[PDB]
Write a protein that binds this ligand. Structure first.
Ligand code: HEM
Ligand code: HEM
Ligand code: HEM
Ligand code: HEM
Lengths: 146, 141, 146, 141
């Protein structure tokens, strides 16, 4: 916000190495462990009693896949995140009642997961590019709130 | 830490508020819903229109909690423990929102306390509401 | 990031009653009292040892006048806050080294001062309009940081 | 509060850092400067270029402070008393920035501790850095 050409290239290059289903399950699981108040949306998901139970929960993993799948597709539209996520924004406000701070916490966790997964390849400049991305996506998802 | 002067200031201001506390609580919530619309995400079951009895009712409870906190300013964690439990484990309001209601409570007090809301009292009230917010979020994880 | 027609009207109407010199001194003074770490930018301003010393400090009053004067000028350009404040944004980053969080704190104190001064006339809808404005001005002043 | 389990988790994870303390501290600072440029407003007097002696030195001191805190996790306010004085009375870094460095420290640890950065340990580390930040800002007003 805004990404330089080199930053866009860095983002795209790293993401091409990502298993979206796995990274999605891991990020959502970690969100519910690290920031447990985020469990408030998932009472229907069954066992969230321990960190191992959250991480291994098939419904948590399923939702992680769904969310990060949408995130992944969004990376093809870095120059139009608001347009890309407008309808999802309206949904998250009007029907799901998700406080947009949740999007920011998820972004934080995603950055930590990428760092964990990629180690030294997740260099300070690569992180900086991803911070722009997760801020952009959270801002886009928050934009139609009212 | 709240200083002896902070505590004196808080008791003075809240004392002047007196019987209007419940009204001011509801006003603060209304200010919050209008200024910071994301806070409305916690209230899909409320009519949030101006004058709403649901907002008035919550406003009275919030105000009573603050009265109790003032009355127990030296033992706030225990006084607010049931509310810390409720917010941490049931309501699960993201901690960022407490600063938003705190600001709106300040603004409400300022709008009703022409004489009392001096810079020193403003500072003490801000510290006090931050302290209450910290207690209310202390059991979140 | 946009005011409604009623919101712009509300902003302009209240501001017609604002003594920008007085309110500016009051808001800057209160910033230094309520968030005393902000005194870090005013080492040369003289006595800031007590609330009364801060509020009566002629350099605090004078600077408050200048700051809120620039704020006031910006209210004539609500659709173009970024452009209006670009030059001051660069100044605050490159020369003054002021963390933009300070702009947010000053916004909060200003809203408090308007509430204190105007009382019931500072209604929840009027406050909400002013919250958009102070957020907009802070974001504008932060925009050229790098 | 840090649970007894949090304390065990932090001591294990930070113990692994060992002699890399300086390196990781400096990396966390660089990550912060790059990701959150407003934080550079506190360092106009530093060469912030990669590999700078000033950033390396501060990195080491930040890390040793964290080591001190981990070793005295039961009484961090006393252990960090001089540093909380320094930040409150002299440096006067806005409290919002502590979350930013904390996040960058957390990222640095994740990038360097593949075996030890489990979900539970991630939670404990995040809580610990938040607690340290709280202590460091406790005397601000
Ligand atoms: C990058 C951030 C996110 C993206 C791209 C995203 C995307 C999505 C998508 C594509 C759906 C399905 C919508 C539909 O069925 O029409 C969804 C549903 C949902 N999302 Fe989000 N989401 C994000 C973050 C979050 C977060 C952080 C939370 C809560 C902590 C959340 C809570 C929910 C809930 C509760 C549902 C409904 C799930 C269900 O009915 O099974 N979302 N989201
Ligand atoms: C000074 C800060 C706060 C205080 C003193 C406070 C106090 C209270 C009290 C006394 C209740 C009633 C509990 C009961 O009926 O058993 C309550 C409920 C509630 N609070 Fe908090 N609260 C604070 C901050 C917040 C914030 C910032 C939010 C969200 C933005 C929030 C959201 C709620 C919700 C959704 C309920 C349940 C209302 C209902 O469904 O009836 N609170 N709070
Ligand atoms: C709406 C927000 C603000 C606006 C529009 C603004 C505008 C200005 C202007 C116009 C000047 C130059 C005055 C002159 O002509 O001499 C100035 C200088 C300055 N500002 Fe800002 N300001 C804002 C907020 C702040 C805040 C919150 C701080 C610090 C807490 C700050 C720190 C400074 C400093 C240190 C100077 C130089 C003072 C000196 O000469 O010693 N500003 N600002
Ligand atoms: C985990 C949180 C933090 C820790 C443990 C920490 C620790 C330290 C330590 C040990 C020193 C050196 C003290 C000395 O040499 O006497 C220091 C100095 C300093 N810190 Fe903090 N700090 C933290 C957060 C921050 C943040 C978030 C900022 C700003 C973004 C900051 C800005 C500074 C500055 C400007 C100095 C002076 C550097 C110099 O000129 O030598 N600190 N800190």
């Amino acid at each position: 916000v805004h990404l330089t050409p080199e930053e866009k290239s860095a983002v795209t290059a790293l993401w091409g190495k990502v298993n979206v289903d796995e990274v999605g399950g891991e990020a959502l699981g970690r969100l519910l462990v690290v920031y447990p108040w985020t469990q408030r949306f998932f009472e229907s998901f069954g066992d969230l009693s321990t960190p191992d139970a959250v991480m291994g929960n098939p419904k948590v993993k399923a939702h992680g896949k769904k969310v990060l799948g949408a995130f992944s597709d969004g990376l093809a539209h870095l120059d139009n995140l608001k347009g890309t996520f407008a309808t999802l924004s309206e949904l998250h406000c009007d029907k799901l009642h998700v406080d947009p701070e949740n999007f920011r916490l998820l972004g934080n966790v995603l950055v930590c997961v990428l760092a964990h997964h990629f180690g030294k390849e997740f260099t300070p400049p690569v992180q900086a590019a991803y911070q722009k991305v997760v801020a952009g996506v959270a801002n886009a998802l928050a934009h139609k709130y009212h | 830490v709240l200083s002896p002067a902070d505590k004196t200031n808080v008791k003075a201001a809240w004392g002047k508020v007196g019987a209007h506390a419940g009204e001011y609580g509801a006003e603060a919530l209304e200010r919050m819903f209008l200024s910071f619309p994301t806070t409305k995400t916690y209230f899909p079951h409320f009519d949030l229109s101006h004058g709403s009895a649901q907002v008035k009712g919550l406003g009275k409870k919030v105000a009573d909690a603050l009265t109790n906190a003032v009355a127990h300013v030296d033992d706030m964690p225990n006084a607010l423990s049931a509310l810390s439990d409720l917010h941490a484990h049931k309501l699960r309001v993201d901690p960022v929102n407490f600063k938003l209601l705190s600001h709106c409570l300040l603004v409400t007090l300022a709008a009703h306390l022409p004489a009392e809301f001096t810079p020193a009292v403003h500072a003490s009230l801000d510290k006090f509401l931050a302290s209450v917010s910290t207690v209310l979020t202390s059991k979140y994880r």
